[PDB]
Amino acid sequence: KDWTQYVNPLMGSQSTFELSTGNTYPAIARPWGMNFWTPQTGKMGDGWQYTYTANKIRGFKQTHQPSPWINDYGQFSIMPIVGQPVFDEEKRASWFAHKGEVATPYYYKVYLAEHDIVTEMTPTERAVLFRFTFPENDHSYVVVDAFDKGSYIKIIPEENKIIGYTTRNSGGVPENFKNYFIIEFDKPFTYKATVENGNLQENVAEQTTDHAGAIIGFKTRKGEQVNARIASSFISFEQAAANMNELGKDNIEQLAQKGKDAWNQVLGKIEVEGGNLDQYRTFYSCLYRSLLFPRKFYELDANGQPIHYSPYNGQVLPGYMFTDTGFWDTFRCLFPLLNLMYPSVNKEMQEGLINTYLESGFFPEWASPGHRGCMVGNNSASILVDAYMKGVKVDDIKTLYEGLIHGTENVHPEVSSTGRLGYEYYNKLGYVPYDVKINENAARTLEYAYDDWCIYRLAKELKRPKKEISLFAKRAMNYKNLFDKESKLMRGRNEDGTFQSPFSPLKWGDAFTEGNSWHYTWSVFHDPQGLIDLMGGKEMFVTMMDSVFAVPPIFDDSYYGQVIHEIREMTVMNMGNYAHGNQPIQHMIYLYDYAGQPWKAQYWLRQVMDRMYTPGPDGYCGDEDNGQTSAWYVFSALGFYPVCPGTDEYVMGTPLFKKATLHFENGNSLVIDAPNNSTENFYIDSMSFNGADHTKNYLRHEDLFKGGTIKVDMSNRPNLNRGTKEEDMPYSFSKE
Numbered sequence: 245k246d247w248t249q250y251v252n253p254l255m256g257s258q259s260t261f262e263l264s265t266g267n268t269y270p271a272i273a274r275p276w277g278m279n280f281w282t283p284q285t286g287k288m289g290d291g292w293q294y295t296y297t298a299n300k301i302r303g304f305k306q307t308h309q310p311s312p313w314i315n316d317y318g319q320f321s322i323m324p325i326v327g328q329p330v331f332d333e334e335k336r337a338s339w340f341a342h343k344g345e346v347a348t349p350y351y352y353k354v355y356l357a358e359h360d361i362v363t364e365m366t367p368t369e370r371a372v373l374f375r376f377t378f379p380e381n382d383h384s385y386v387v388v389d390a391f392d393k394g395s396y397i398k399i400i401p402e403e404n405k406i407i408g409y410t411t412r413n414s415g416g417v418p419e420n421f422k423n424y425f426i427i428e429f430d431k432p433f434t435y436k437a438t439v440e441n442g443n444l445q446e447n448v449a450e451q452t453t454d455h456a457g458a459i460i461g462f463k464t465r466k467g468e469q470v471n472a473r474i475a476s477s478f479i480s481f482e483q484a485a486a487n488m489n490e491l492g493k494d495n496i497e498q499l500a501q502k503g504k505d506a507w508n509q510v511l512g513k514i515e516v517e518g519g520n521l522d523q524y525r526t527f528y529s530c531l532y533r534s535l536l537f538p539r540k541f542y543e544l545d546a547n548g549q550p551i552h553y554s555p556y557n558g559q560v561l562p563g564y565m566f567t568d569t570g571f572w573d574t575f576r577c578l579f580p581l582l583n584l585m586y587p588s589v590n591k592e593m594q595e596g597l598i599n600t601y602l603e604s605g606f607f608p609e610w611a612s613p614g615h616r617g618c619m620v621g622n623n624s625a626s627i628l629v630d631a632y633m634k635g636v637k638v639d640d641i642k643t644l645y646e647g648l649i650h651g652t653e654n655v656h657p658e659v660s661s662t663g664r665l666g667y668e669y670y671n672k673l674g675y676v677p678y679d680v681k682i683n684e685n686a687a688r689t690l691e692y693a694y695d696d697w698c699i700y701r702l703a704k705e706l707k708r709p710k711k712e713i714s715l716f717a718k719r720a721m722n723y724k725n726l727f728d729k730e731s732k733l734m735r736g737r738n739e740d741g742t743f744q745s746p747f748s749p750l751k752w753g754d755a756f757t758e759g760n761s762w763h764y765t766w767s768v769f770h771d772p773q774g775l776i777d778l779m780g781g782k783e784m785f786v787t788m789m790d791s792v793f794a795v796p797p798i799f800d801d802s803y804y805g806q807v808i809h810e811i812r813e814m815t816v817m818n819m820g821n822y823a824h825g826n827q828p829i830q831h832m833i834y835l836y837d838y839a840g841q842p843w844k845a846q847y848w849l850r851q852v853m854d855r856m857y858t859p860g861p862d863g864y865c866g867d868e869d870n871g872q873t874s875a876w877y878v879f880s881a882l883g884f885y886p887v888c889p890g891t892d893e894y895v896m897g898t899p900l901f902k903k904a905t906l907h908f909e910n911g912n913s914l915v916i917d918a919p920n921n922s923t924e925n926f927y928i929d930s931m932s933f934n935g936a937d938h939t940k941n942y943l944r945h946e947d948l949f950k951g952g953t954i955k956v957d958m959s960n961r962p963n964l965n966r967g968t969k970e971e972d973m974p975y976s977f978s979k980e
């Protein structure tokens with residue numbers, strides 16, 4: 245059975261600075277691969293390294309980039325050309341068309357029209373094989389570009405080899421940062437030149453310079469194939485040579501089959517059927533995008549044991565390491581998806597986090613590859629705790645707990661999004677104030693309160709002193725400190741305790757991030773009942789919820805002075821103020837379940853799935869955000885979602901397919917059977933779990949893992965009675 249046929253690596257590529265439909269590039273890679281490869285249409289340095297509307301490719305590039313905003317590191321490219329040996333990234337570039345291109349996760353091919361050259365590539369976790377098919381020509385070349393900001397290159401003709409290192413990066417790296425690469429050709433060089441700050445230096449073997457490059461060449465006959473085996477390491481040249489062994493002596497066809505198999509192994513853990521082709525493509529493309537980040541950042545020693553270059557301190561050290569994710573995005577459902585479907589993989593990642601804390605003094609929030617200043621919150625706490633409570637348990641629990649506590653009373657001296665900026669005010673006042681020069685203060689406070697609930701959970705589980713458990717149980721309620729009873733919304737609060745005026749509920753940023761009050765107010769994952777209580781009961785809560793959808797997409801952009809692309813993206817979708825791309829709001833629709841109206845979740849969730857995601861190049865309604873926006877679709881299509889990681893619950897939405905089968909790593913399987921599902925029948929009339937009537941609006945992790953059958957009776961009419969009882973409600977801390 246193949247699922248890769250449904251994966252479109254071009255989904256999200258039709259994006260620009262001005263307007264996102266995913267801001268992705270085609271990651272040709274193994275799952276969680278250390279090195280990704282992509283065709284490169286953008287100029288060196290441009291975060292938009294591949295865009296669908298671009299006409300020319302100027303290299304095939306090794307990349308580690310998680311988003312255009314974060315940008316790249318450990319990057320170099322290769323480009324086959326004919327005619328004159330030219331290094332310049334414009335002069336060497338070639339027209340292509342998407343109809344001369346084949347993009348899959350395990351194999352990429354393109355016809356370079358201006359050189360009459362076909363390029364094919366098939367990666368492994370750390371290496372890749374290139375096959376170039378050249379035309380008849382006296383002057384055929386391959387250009388190797390080590391990029392700028394200080395690089396190195398060496399041509400070794402007696403070995404048909406080129407080695408080099410690249411350092412261009414976007415921050416978050418140690419001083420000794422390098423990515424060492426080795427390229428072996430199966431055709432010997434008849435022409436050889438290094439490049440030094442744009443000057444071709446024929447027969448000069450080596451360069452150490454700002455922007456090193458190499459051009460080798462030969463005569464080719466029509467249809468002549470030249471293969472290049474490439475690997476890189478963050479450790480050393482000898483380690484890169486070891487990494488090359490992943491290629492064995494395989495050809496393109498053999499490596500493509502191994503990558504296809506690797507992908508089918510992970511994609512095939514979730515088998516959907518009884519939908520249409522657009523849905524299959526959307527689903528598996530989103531699943532593919534959910535299994536890329538964070539990437540492996542470890543390599544294998546002579547004994548097959550993991551070692552890694554430390555992006556935190558520059559040492560080479562034993563153990564697992566992963567990077568390139570922002571927990572502000574990925575705590576929400578991306579990491580939970582791994583705890584459900586791929587826990588063995590998150591086990592490695594969690595050990596990597598322990599290594600991050602050991603190496604750098606902090607758990608990461610945004611890492612690429614080292615600590616990076618981006619977004620907000622202490623959501624590493626959610627990641628660590630959710631794993632543990634779901635049985636993904638690190639070896640050194642003591643260090644894990646100490647790391648967590650460390651993060652509640654420290655902020656990283658250089659990277660303000662690492663640790664807790666404003667923790668002094670928060671610990672003292674119960675909130676980060678609006679008028680103390682700490683922006684995003686309300687968003688930080690709300691996420692910290694949830695984060696402290698996660699810590700409370702773990703402290704209780706670990707049998708910590710009652711004094712510690714009480715501290716964090718109290719901090720978990722800090723969300724109440726920003727609730728404005730007058731507007732029924734969250735509101736920035738001055739240091740002196742008064743709420744800030746004038747108050748603008750539609751103003752994006754400022755007190756919040758990636759949205760306004762209407763978007764962030766719902767960020768009480770651990771205590772929705774508490775929020776319902778604050779607003780005066782379930783009827784008023786639903787009145788407020790419903791109003792998000794019913795109003796026009798009006799906004800206040802005065803924080804920015806202009807309509808930023810995230811605001812534009814909301815305005816065009818015809819969903820009121822529900823801006824699906826803003827991460828803080830993505831769990832929102834599930835909250836209808838907690839207010840006794842699950843049928844409203846069913847209605848709106850289905851609207852989002854049918855309208856906000858498409859399988860084409862312009863697929864997503866905003867940035868994909870390293871798996872979070874994709875994993876949202878994966879979960880929601882199955883019919884449930886981890887509103888509150890750290891609990892064992894998935895909150896019920898509405899399934900998209902007539903049938904979905906989950907295959908768990910523990911060897912058990914779960915069938916979600918919804919035979920009456922259709923475009924019209926998106927309401928849950930009733931539901932059973934292994935035959936037992938199930939009116940609850942949540943499912944438990946442990947019960948799913950036991951396997952069996954969930955049967956969902958789908959209807960075109962809402963069932964106004966199902967899921968409204970007290971015992972049907974998912975978890976709230978206030979009730980606990």
Ligand SMILES: [Ca+2]
Binds near residue numbers: 758869
């Ligand atoms: Ca977003």
